[PDB]
Symmetry: C8
Subunit: 30 residues, 8 copies
């Protein structure tokens, strides 16, 4: 359904934020 799919698009975007935060950890450590 379109609303479940839209909700899933939110979850994928949140995963992008987690990845970006991971990059900041790499930046600090380096």
């Amino acid at each position: 359904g379109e609303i479940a799919q839209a909700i899933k698009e939110i979850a994928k975007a949140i995963k992008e934020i987690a990845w970006a935060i991971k990059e900041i950890a790499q930046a600090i450590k380096g």
Copy 2:
């Protein structure tokens, strides 16, 4: 539907936050 589309607009905005955090990571690496 309008609700599903508005939920997608939230997902797009959340992606924009991910891109901005990536910019912070790169600014730290530099």
Copy 3:
């Protein structure tokens, strides 16, 4: 509809957060 519009208002606010985070990247880089 009023609920779709309210949801869209959330997406616009999230976009404001992304912009502010972009500013922090500029601040760090400078």
Copy 4:
């Protein structure tokens, strides 16, 4: 409606977070 209005209250609060992040950006620039 009360639900749409409560959702708008969330959007206003999310804007307040954007303003606060802008203050961090300016504090770094200073």
Copy 5:
């Protein structure tokens, strides 16, 4: 209604986050 009130409780919590972020700006500036 109970669901609108619960949603409003979310908005108030988000406002608490904005205030805390404001404190971080004060901390940095000081």
Copy 6:
């Protein structure tokens, strides 16, 4: 209702994030 109560649980968790950010502010001030 169970849905309203679960939404309140999210609001309580969001408050916990505010408290944690306040701890960062105080750690910076110190």
Copy 7:
């Protein structure tokens, strides 16, 4: 109900974020 339980899973995840932010306060203070 499954939707209330899913919402509760969101609240527990948000609590994990609060805990992680608490760790950052400890890291800064130390």
Copy 8:
């Protein structure tokens, strides 16, 4: 149901953000 499952996908993504923040904490401690 598909909606409950999509909401769970959001919770999993939010956990991923917690793990990433923990990495920042450890990078600071190091």
